[PDB]
């Protein structure tokens, strides 16, 4: 639950394979795991759509960061084929991936670098940066100027 809470670090599910296996083996708690796998197809849909759900959720988490994870290398670190990653993109087109940038020559994707209208985006960033430097520069300047008065 803590790994699924937030800031999901890219980890291998093989460590979770034995966790789920012993989750089916031990009967002290969470016993009805065989009842979760009761149906021949329902448990398979919950498992495939479960690993799919976390392999999409971690993409939704790393999509906030603009670090350019270079999903071409990520497909190599995840040890999976690029075809089911294109199917994952087929899940992203319904997952509202409209804010993205792809490349015809290479395979690197970009979740940022829009047309960047200078009257809205650079306007906003320059407003928060310049104004934040102005008022933040204003607070501790005279605040420290009042802190040095106690030395007399």
């Amino acid at each position: 639950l803590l790994k699924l809470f937030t800031t999901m670090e890219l980890m291998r599910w093989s460590t979770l394979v034995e966790d789920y296996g012993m989750e089916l083996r031990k009967g002290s708690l969470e016993s009805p795991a065989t009842d979760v796998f009761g149906s021949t197809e329902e448990g398979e849909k919950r498992w495939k759509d479960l690993k799919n759900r976390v392999v999409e959720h971690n993409i939704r988490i790393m999509a906030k960061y603009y670090t350019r994870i270079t999903m071409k290398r990520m497909a190599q670190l995840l040890d999976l084929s690029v075809d089911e990653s294109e199917a994952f993109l087929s899940n992203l087109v319904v997952n509202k991936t409209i804010f993205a940038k792809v490349d015809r020559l290479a395979g690197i994707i970009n979740f940022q670098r829009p047309k960047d209208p200078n009257n809205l985006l650079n306007d906003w960033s320059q407003k928060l940066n310049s104004l934040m430097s102005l008022v933040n520069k204003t607070t501790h300047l005279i605040a420290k100027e009042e802190m040095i008065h106690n030395l007399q």
């Binding site: 993109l89 087109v93 409209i98 993205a100 792809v102 490349d103 015809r104």
Partner: protein
């Protein structure tokens, strides 16, 4: 009624015993059109325009409307797969529809 994109009532009209006695080779092509509409397929609609063109050859002027439905589903597919792809291969995106780039390029550029 198929121009307004409702194949369920088409199934309701071909499942009733009243209009079932007047069925024939004419309504089969309409069942393939409604099947391609509920399946959201394009090459299957071209198969309906290929095998049944010998009852689609005597089709009335509404053939232009049927071509408007074909080009409408084509427009939905184009705004479906191209919209998330800023820059992508023409064969990587045309391989899904397994159609040539001639008609697709002409309709797009048009």
């Amino acid at each position: 009624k198929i121009m307004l994109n409702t194949p369920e009532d088409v199934q309701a009209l071909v499942s009733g015993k009243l209009a079932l006695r007047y069925a024939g080779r004419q309504t089969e092509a309409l069942k393939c059109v409604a099947q391609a509409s509920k399946n959201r397929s394009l090459a299957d609609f071209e198969k309906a325009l290929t095998d049944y063109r010998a009852e689609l050859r005597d089709d009335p002027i509404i053939s232009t409307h049927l071509a408007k439905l074909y080009d409408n589903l084509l427009e939905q597919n184009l705004i479906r797969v191209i919209e998330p792809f800023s820059r992508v291969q023409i064969e990587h995106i045309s391989s899904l529809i397994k159609l040539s780039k001639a008609d697709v390029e002409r309709k797009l550029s048009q």
